[PDB]
Design an enzyme around this catalytic site. Structure first.
Site, short mmCIF file in Angstrom:
data_model
loop_
_atom_site.label_atom_id
_atom_site.label_comp_id
_atom_site.label_asym_id
_atom_site.label_seq_id
_atom_site.Cartn_x
_atom_site.Cartn_y
_atom_site.Cartn_z
N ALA A 126 0.85 -1.18 0.00
CA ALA A 126 0.00 0.00 0.00
C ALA A 126 0.88 1.23 0.00
O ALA A 126 2.10 1.15 0.18
CB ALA A 126 -0.95 0.01 1.20
N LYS A 127 0.25 2.38 -0.21
CA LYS A 127 0.95 3.66 -0.19
C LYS A 127 -0.04 4.81 -0.13
O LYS A 127 -1.01 4.83 -0.89
CB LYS A 127 1.83 3.81 -1.43
CG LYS A 127 2.71 5.03 -1.41
CD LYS A 127 3.92 4.81 -0.53
CE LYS A 127 4.97 5.86 -0.78
NZ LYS A 127 6.00 5.86 0.29
N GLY A 128 0.17 5.78 0.76
CA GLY A 128 -0.78 6.86 0.86
C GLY A 128 -0.09 8.16 1.22
O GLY A 128 1.13 8.20 1.39
N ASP B 146 7.12 7.86 6.48
CA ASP B 146 7.85 8.03 5.23
C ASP B 146 8.43 9.44 5.23
O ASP B 146 8.51 10.09 6.28
CB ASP B 146 6.94 7.74 4.03
CG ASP B 146 7.71 7.47 2.77
OD1 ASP B 146 7.35 6.52 2.05
OD2 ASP B 146 8.68 8.20 2.49
#
Ligand SMILES: [Ca+2]
Ligand SMILES: [Ca+2]
Ligand SMILES: [Ca+2]
Ligand SMILES: [Ca+2]
EC number: 1.4.1.3
Lengths: 410, 410, 410, 410
Positions: free
Chosen positions: B100-102, B141
């Site tokens: 995933a990535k947001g 991140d």
């Protein structure tokens, strides 16, 4: 072309109201957007994958309402515009809903019945936690019918228990509502009656020119003829007829049942299919296509009232030409709002657990349309504009007022 | 450039494995994508609106894992590529996660501390029902640190009760894990040791050239010097030094603490910052930038082993040139996998309710890296390719096998 | 003083009914009491902490109903007494509710708008799992208005989805009810009409003396004058006027709009503000303060009917003096019950999803008040007491009957 | 007397740390307080009503922990003080818990077994939604034993499914932990060993005087004698014995089993029960009562180390007298922390689903106590105070740091 009308109208309405820039920016951004993957095995055994989407614009006034579309070609800008338009339209009709729009990017003419059911059930399983009775209520649209709503209801019931009010447009024996088929024509007739009574006239003893026999056209024609008016011109995709002293609609309906056209009718002579828009008449009602009025036709028309029962039948330059002529145009954001009102009534009946009769539905529909027109007329008188900008101003004002009243987290 | 490497590698790996086209199409489409609106009042009182996003690729092997990014400029293609890369990387390291990535499209250098906290809490409130302990676990991140994870934990706890395992990277006193800062350097050292022991050599008595002193570079240099090797060249953003008989890293670390540079060191002479990549050495470890190896530098290098501790340091043409030369390149998909493994260990410790000591963490990390290298070597031997395609083949094979084993709704 | 009246009346009512001691002890202990800490940052940045509380007395007949109070000074005994009084009052009016009372110990005159919103939202977050649609329904009180209910609704919706029926007293465009402002005056007029018709008289052609122009006073005066009666004395905080043949209330209302007082009116002469309570009249209606009747004034009054539209306007010794005189006093537990009934109607409308018109609200209110008076008269005739003890006996009997019917875990 | 010690110590610790006033005010207010009504039918059939209460102080570090008390007389100030003390004690021992305290105001010596079970089950039904595995974990206290925990577990399981980790102190066959009975004595011995090893001495070859044979006293005496020390004086509620060269504890335990006293022992002569506190010894361990040291006894004692294994055995003036003498006192907040640590271990074992052996429990207990003492010594050295204020400073600092790290809603 259909996506620029809505946002241009929004900018103009915001300019009229003197809204803050921050609030307008907040009203641009949708509440939520979702994309999911729907993969099913075909009848052979092989896999096919599509992409389903759902856009939810605002929920400041209640649950969200919108249609499910099964069309191969999709565009995020068009979907956002449609969701925003549904928000404003619901705000105008004064029903406690918001706006949404979703669908699947597939062509339903290539799938059998079983594959179509599998696709619907998988889509429902993937978006089950983002809809609900008080969250988001899907409705049928093009490429979709009542059977799809039955399948959606079945799957959602498997997940959250028996919830008949999660969808609208169900079959009659699964909890549907009476009076759905004639809702839009009833609404158009009620709106026309209110508009005429504004100036002191009445439907009895006027001249009407109706373009098309979809459900809306045939129901509006039948209701108008019953009320006491006379219709003098009728069109279709194939053919067009005229009669200066009135056409027997009750006979024409059964003529179309057998022949399937309007050729060789008894009480009326055939006419060219490009001149009826210029006939002498009191009311002109386009019901089939949009954009049929433009620069070339703008100067020739000689009607006194135009009721936009279709989707975007008038161009802006034609609108200004007609304004300078002196005619009155009822906006389409309000004229064809019968369907959403009857869907709201069905939702209410399912929430209450008790079904209404048809008379109650018709009385409530009449009351809602009359009240909406009175509100739009008052708002139009307050700011000194025409009817279209009155409608859009009323909708935007309601939504903004609710949003600011609800709060901004301090 | 960084988004084409991952998909080209996927196509090549699918060609090697002989995968079905339907399965590949299904592995392209992400499981879900979400966009939400985050509106907050500033310290003055005025409103600001941003758009937050979250992409979730696959969940065939367990929960989803990915980072939250606070950067002004976003691109859907880059985000999809990063999510897919996380999926493959997790599959390689053999931990039960997905991808995933947001993030949020804002610039955190313009917001104060209070506004930043408000933004984080509002984002969490908007996406609270799409994450969870066994659903999706955010991680920090760039633009984000441990304090943001603390705020996310607080809001999610308000919603679903005390759930310490919903995020990773928390402070130590809120349930963090020991050994987080040195995870990546430990991983690089373990991978290098395994690669060397494959051919029969050992770290003790070899020559290393390390490019950079981020956390990875300094920790790898310190661990290598402790093991028994000698480092002969060191770079930085400002300056570079050399010593043919070995540099005292323990002294250099404290020298950089005070001076803040590598100039005027005691045990080493300054060198040009564009030649160390061509030094005589046994192992070359780039740790700072990507793409630093290309056509011009490809023919000049004379190393025997390259360990890609950075993100994409090698271009394809340079890779083929180096293959024809006869050197061995450890892919970056595997070399820098220490961080995700330690995050998985922290998740396990929070699930169990009992914290480990540092020795247990280090032993488990060593075991996981060694086992991963043995698996990659076996898969590389089976299909007769190099190490990079072995890694990607192993990851894709694991994910596809789990997906087909789980089922397709008949 | 206001907390001893309720418990003395309860003891007397229990003595009349011959209740068991165990049941009375069980009716003393509240169902639940809660204290929470609410800490917010001010506009400067500094922290402020308050203590919020909520008392829930009984739920034997349905959900709990009660108000939220923002006052600096609190007392557990007063709060318990108010909750118990709400329980009995709801039992008298025959609506399916219980009793509750809550608030925050803060002074709202020192907080800005943003800080007040933050305080409300934090309080809601802390007590969100102890209220609900069928559990406990907050209402506005002193220091609170409709905006606070909007904020509470917003936060609770964030937690449990869109739940418009969790609070009552919302703005009109957020789901409020029509006829809220005139509910209490309508109720007082209906109760007075029923009491008069009991003895054979009627409102048309009688004399009324009204003390005060809050909402209750002005609405009762206007409705009485419309019905056909004549008012001969009016008070206020500043001034008082008299007219032996009737005062034009419709003119007086607009006179107060501009002047802001009752001085120099046209159709009436000024009078001392301490004698109107002793005027010759048929009905006396105090609407402003409590305890205004005591030993000194008890012997002087010469009215024939007293309607207690305020909160506790009569002392016990004055009550016995008046009983020996031969006058009739309508208790305040029943006279001013219009507000709770209209709040119940709003709750019903929000549960059903469909709004009523004002006529339906007024008819339902009239029916409920008439039925309540007939029940109270029957219960008063059964046990041979006065009206106040009839009311309290009826309420206590209903609550005890429901409690014993529901069960005691064997 | 026991409630003033804790708050005086808190004020002193806050003064030492230089805490903000706002944070201290926030640390005074408990997180939540609850009162409920518990009504049961007796064996005859008649009803009895009691009032149950629960106070929950802080949850900044994890779940809440506290005991359930069945005592007729209650006081809100005492309960708040006990909850706060549990918070600080948990912070000192470094286990991830908070503080709480609850109970019922009844006398368990008047109720049969069935009535007691009914009372426990009703209490659990009333407070079921305010406790949980990660919310609040009850423990037994005075008037309560393991059977009550079994009943609480049964009812909570009826509500939320099988949750063995909701309570601690369960029977062995329902998920209890090994080593519970000897936890406190083991802890006292470990703390004494650490304190002695601080100064360079050791337990082997020293003199101990122990006051009492509750579980703590007998277990500490047995463990000390096993280690290699010699005990020269023993007390009880009835009798006291002495032996200058050491008492055979293994024989004394079986002597007390049959005789039931300490009179006519073999290896020791009887002594007055008011002089053993003044014996020549190296370590003095009171284990029975609190406040036994005061002004009169302060000047006479000639011990070199005091270990407070009881609850508040030392008065402040005696503490200052002893400080001027030059003796060292281990605070009771740390000495008797074995029980809570073993309860935490049982909670961990139930969360994991797998039971430990006794050796693992003892090793973990030893590690935790040693680490706690090292931390307390470091914090005492930092601020230049004694051991008691070091303990309280460490606890308050941990709690405040977690609270400020977690956030304040901007
Ligand atoms: Ca919006
Ligand atoms: Ca997929
Ligand atoms: Ca009760
Ligand atoms: Ca607190």
């Amino acid at each position: 072309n259909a996506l620029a009308a809505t946002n241009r109208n929004f900018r103009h309405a915001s300019r009229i109201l003197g809204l803050d820039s921050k609030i307008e920016r907040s009203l641009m951004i949708p509440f939520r957007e979702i994309k999911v993957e729907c993969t099913i095995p075909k009848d052979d055994g092989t896999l096919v994958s599509y992409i389903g989407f759902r856009v939810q614009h605002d929920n400041a006034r209640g649950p969200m309402k919108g249609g499910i579309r099964y069309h191969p070609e999709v565009d995020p800008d068009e979907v956002n515009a449609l969701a925003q338009l549904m928000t404003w339209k619901t705000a105008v009709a004064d029903i406690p809903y918001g706006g949404a729009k979703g669908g699947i990017g597939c062509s339903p003419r290539d799938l059998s019945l079983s594959e179509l059911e599998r696709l619907t059930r998988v889509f429902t399983q993937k978006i089950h936690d983002l809809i609900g009775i008080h969250t988001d209520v899907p409705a049928p649209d093009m490429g979709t019918n009542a059977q799809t709503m039955a399948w959606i209801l079945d799957e959602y019931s498997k997940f959250h228990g028996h919830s008949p009010a999660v969808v609208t447009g169900k079959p009659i024996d699964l909890g549907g509502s009476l009076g759905r088929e004639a809702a839009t024509g009833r609404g158009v007739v009620f709106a026309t009656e209110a508009l005429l009574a504004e100036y002191g006239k009445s439907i009895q003893g006027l001249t009407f020119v109706i373009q098309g026999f979809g459900n809306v056209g045939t129901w509006a024609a039948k209701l108008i003829h019953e009320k006491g008016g006379k219709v003098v011109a009728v069109s279709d995709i194939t053919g067009a007829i005229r009669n200066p002293e009135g056409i027997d609609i009750n006979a024409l309906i059964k003529h179309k049942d057998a022949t399937g056209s309007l050729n060789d009718f008894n009480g009326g002579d055939a006419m060219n299919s490009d001149e009826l828009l210029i006939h002498e008449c009191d009311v002109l009602i386009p019901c089939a296509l949009g954009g049929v009025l433009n620069k070339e036709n703008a100067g020739d028309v000689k009607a006194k009232f135009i009721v936009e029962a279709a989707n975007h039948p008038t161009d802006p330059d034609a609108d200004e030409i007609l304004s300078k002529k002196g005619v009155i145009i009822l906006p389409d954001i309000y004229a064809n709002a019968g369907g959403v009102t009857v869907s709201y009534f069905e939702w209410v009946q399912n929430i209450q657990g008790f079904m209404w009769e048809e008379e109650k539905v018709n009385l409530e529909l009449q009351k809602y349309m009359t009240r909406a027109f009175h509100n739009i007329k008052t708002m139009c008188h307050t700011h000194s504009c025409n009817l279209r900008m009155g409608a859009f101003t009323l909708g935007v004002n309601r939504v903004a007022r609710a949003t600011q009243l609800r709060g901004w987290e301090a």
